[PDB]
Symmetry: C5
Subunit: 155 residues, 5 copies
């Protein structure tokens, strides 16, 4: 054997094919399929509907699924609605509503702008929804999918 393989083997820890049966799943407590395990429930759902304020979705470590819509405005509009992740020093917008660019009119129709995110927060991070104006709203739901170590949280 001459190989990267020794390297992966190193980090992580023949000519007869061996027939095996994998019992990880049952030893793990049974199978939990991704779509079911990520299900929203009444108790686990972080519902939000933010207009003219800043509202925390999550501020403790872990992985979060967050889906929803923002009120679209002209890209030059003064009315903003976003999902952003921040630590108070650096802030990054993960979903932006000022995206549309009408031509030849000041009558500007608006549509929802969908977002569907998986965000991982570590210590000191905050995932928040923000709207700076009563006319625009960040609406959606979120839930914790897993703890910061990656251990899955049952729905």
């Amino acid at each position: 054997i001459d190989s990267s393989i020794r390297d992966k083997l190193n980090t992580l820890l023949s000519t007869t094919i061996i027939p095996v049966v994998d019992l990880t799943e049952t030893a793990e407590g049974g199978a939990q399929r991704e779509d079911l395990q990520k299900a929203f429930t009444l108790i686990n759902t972080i519902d939000f509907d933010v207009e003219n304020t800043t509202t925390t979705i999550a501020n403790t470590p872990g992985f979060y699924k967050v889906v929803g819509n923002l009120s679209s405005r002209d890209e030059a509009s003064g009315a903003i609605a976003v999902i952003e992740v921040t630590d108070g020093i650096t802030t990054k917008i993960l979903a932006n509503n000022r995206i549309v660019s009408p031509d030849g009119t000041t009558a500007v129709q608006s549509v929802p702008v969908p977002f569907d995110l998986m965000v991982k927060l570590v210590a000191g991070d905050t995932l928040q929804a923000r709207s700076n104006n009563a006319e625009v709203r960040v609406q959606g739901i979120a839930r914790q999918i897993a703890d910061v170590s990656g251990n899955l949280i049952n729905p």
Copy 2:
């Protein structure tokens, strides 16, 4: 860091080739299919309609009638237990500017919702002008056992 102790109440430097016989000893997309019999179809106008109120996982997909965020017309998917209600899909999202002629679009939702004892998944419209439309089916029981289409 031995998870070997939990599942099963040194390391070799020789890689052994294997073949897995587990499967031999249902695909997700097929398992979750809609049929005439399992489909919970709904088209909700000026009323509140229960999609499901018995424990289990449900898949629910469809559209709401968009309205101005300032509108009084409500069309939503929501989960309640009669004490706490949380909205899972909201129609009052649009923000037109420089006009009172407010075009509307469908607002799509595609959700997996688990209900436990006493939970209700429901579609609600408070006005004849806005709709909650879509379909649902039960994907699994409350214990996570899959249901065949």
Copy 3:
């Protein structure tokens, strides 16, 4: 490099339907795919071809997409209309007695105007038909369309169908 007793009835039952455990972790490389002649991957299995594609563009009639047992993928668009319109464009499943709408076009709720813009209403479904079932596309009016494509993905039994 010696073993250890284990106490599980969940593992034990599962091994009968399909004790102790060694303390030397073996590196392996799975050869099951090659051994089988290559494995199928979902996204390729479900591919559309010129032969298998059921294309439809439906206007002011009712058109069968499929009416024989099996699992069907069906994707496309409907012409959106005001929720109050009489103009209907839908994907439905029926058995001649009960009919259920799987995609619905009468959804928009314009306000303060009667000039009603329209957009495509996307659908993307997996539908299993059993004996007697029909999947159809229906437009009741020349102004509205049901457009899209579909193909049989697997038989009523579940056996995947090569593209």
Copy 4:
């Protein structure tokens, strides 16, 4: 060790390993398969677009071949939506020169009480397999409507994957 009684398993093993006992000692393994093959081992990485593999297209008032050799293709993008009554056509189609099937159609909107007809993108996202003589194409019959997108070959006609 013990003996197994199952014909299905003996048959699976017969075909998988061409030319029966069980064990009661669970062996903890680690899997190095993805590393021994190396890179783009997960579906999403293997299907990546690159500057070299990307078939970019932006079609206006002409027919443009996206692919015409056997293989599985991923093709994603948008059409200019027009009124369902329009004569302006922007589609993705597949053909053998005899039969032609549209896989993404742009003539879908149904405005009411106006002739000022707003237009939006109509997204498509397809997996298409072509055999000998099949052509995958984008077609616009008018300079006012576009078929835009990207495609790439995901696999040869036999299902063997192509690295990005």
Copy 5:
């Protein structure tokens, strides 16, 4: 007991630079635990404050990434008429060949010059090799390219953990 096996031979030589067993071995797999956990696609691909390449491009060309590896990039462009002079798009380039991967000039209004605009979404997995650049570009103050990206894997295909 052993038995001789006579594709698999080619695979073994390729994979690890011939016989079978009759005793079926029960086993547990700890690779994900050994890899450090959260290797499930959705978790591993998560955006974080540190890894997120956020961009909001207007009237300028902005690099999203220009070093080898696989990137996920998602976002929106400001739609314009297909004949519009205002472009915002996401494209990969080598400084010789450039290809647009998301294009905003898609709408075709009829019977009006009052042209409404919507977000044009993109969701891409892009692999850059040496000399490749992925960038967002807008030629006009009126149109944006917005969204986020991160590196999912190195060019060799090793996953990067969030």
